[PDB]
Every structure is written in C-alpha cells, then in structure tokens.
C-alpha cells in the first residue's frame, strides 16, 4: 500500500479493490435495493445502470452532480476507465496527486515536477480510431500524430485527419 501502490500507479495496473467508474454527467440519481443497483442518472437522452458485488458504499444519494469519474464504490479509481470517462487531462492530475499522497504519508517530500514527467511519459501513445495512411488499432505517439494533421493541412490538401484515441 506504500511502494506497491506507487507501482500500481506508475504501472497503470488495475487497482487492487476496484470501485467501478461513472460514465456521463447529470443529476446523481441511484436506486435502492436489489442485487444490481438500478442507478438512473438523467442527462440528455442517456441514463444510468450499474452492476457490482454486494459490499459497496456510495457516499452520494439522489440529487447533486454525478459527473464523470466520481466516487461510486468509493476506493481505488481505475485510471484506465477514468481515461475514457473524463479524458487525458484529468488522469494526469489524478495519478500525480495520489502518488504524491503516498510519499506525503511517510514524511519524505519531493517536488511534483518529477512525478509529472513520468506520468506525462505514460501518456505519450495513442491508439488509432480512424485510418488515413496507417492502420487502425495501432499504438502510436501523440506528437507523431501532430505532424499528421499539421502537415496534411497547412502544407497539403489531404483533408483526412486520422482520429486518435487517448491511451494510458
């Protein structure tokens, strides 16, 4: 839970005790009983519905803001699911924070910059979602996709921007 937790953070491994993940936003609205919690948020055209084992705490009744990647089963948040839940920007702010929390706990204190470099390095590759020159589902660096759009647009007429997907 000290060094190992740090590892789970840097290795982006599936958290020890997972705590599910919220998808979309709207008014927090969740059901009550039944083995499968019949959650029902709202928003535009969507809704909610989840499923997990028995032992679970929520911390949030019906009414307020649910958002994406909020406290659900309250515990260790999956950074992977959170990537598709809240985006690239959020994860970088999450990981650094909890990693730093671990080190804070045992008194030894280092600057956030250092951790921020490693976590930025964990966020360099992005998986293709729309092929134009290369194949889809291909693991590729974000900055290598910079020159794609940039050059094909400002220099070329090739209006086929390859859509990439954030990959943690």
- Looking at the DSSP assignment, which residues form a beta bridge with residue 140? 126
**Residue 30 to residue 89: CA distance in whole angstroms:** 28
Does residue 106 contact residue 2 with C-beta atoms inside 8 Å? Answer: yes
**Residue 38 to residue 61: CA distance in whole angstroms:** 13
**Residue 64 to residue 33: CA distance in whole angstroms:** 20
Place of tokens 């059901």: 31
Burial of 99 (0-12, 13-18, 19+ CB in 10 A): buried
Closest CA to 1 of 78, 72, 76, 96: 76
CA 48 from chain centre, in angstroms, equals 18
In eight-state DSSP terms, residue 8 is H
Q: Could you tell me the two tokens for 43?
A: 């928003």
Instruction: State phi, psi for 129 to the nearest 5 degrees.
Output: -125, -15
Q: Could you tell me the two tokens for 110?
A: 């280092």
The reported resolution of this PDB entry, expressed in Å, is 3.5
Q: What is the dihedral of CA 25, 163, 137, 5, to 10 degrees?
A: -50
In the sheet that holds 125-128, the strands lie side by side as 139-141, 125-128, 164-166
PDB experimental method:
X-ray
Does residue 71 contact residue 20 with C-beta atoms inside 8 Å? Answer: no
**Residue 168 to residue 125: CA distance in whole angstroms:** 7
Closest CA to 26 of 46, 6, 7, 53: 46
Which H or E run includes 146? helix 142-150
Place of tokens 């930025």: 120
Query: Cβ–Cβ contacts within 10 Å for residue 48, how many?
Result: 20
| Region for residue 107 given its phi and psi (left: phi exceeds 0; alpha: psi -120 to 50; beta: otherwise) | left
């Amino acid at each position: 839970q000290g060094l190992p937790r740090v590892i789970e953070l840097f290795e982006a491994r599936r958290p020890k005790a997972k705590a599910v993940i919220s998808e979309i936003d709207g008014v927090v609205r969740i059901e009550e009983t039944e083995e499968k919690l019949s959650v029902f948020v709202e928003s535009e055209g969507f809704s909610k519905e989840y499923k997990l084992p028995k032992e679970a705490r929520l911390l949030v009744k019906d009414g307020d803001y649910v958002e994406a990647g909020q406290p659900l089963t309250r515990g260790a948040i999956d950074p992977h699911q959170l990537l598709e839940a809240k985006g690239p920007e959020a994860v970088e702010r999450y990981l650094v924070e909890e990693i730093q929390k671990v080190y804070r706990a045992q008194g030894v204190k280092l600057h956030d910059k250092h951790i921020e470099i490693v976590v930025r390095q964990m966020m360099k590759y992005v998986e293709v979602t729309d092929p134009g020159d290369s194949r889809l589902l291909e693991g590729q660096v974000l900055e290598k996709w910079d020159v794609e759009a940039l050059n094909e647009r400002l220099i070329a007429e090739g209006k086929t921007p390859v859509a990439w997907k954030p990959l943690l």
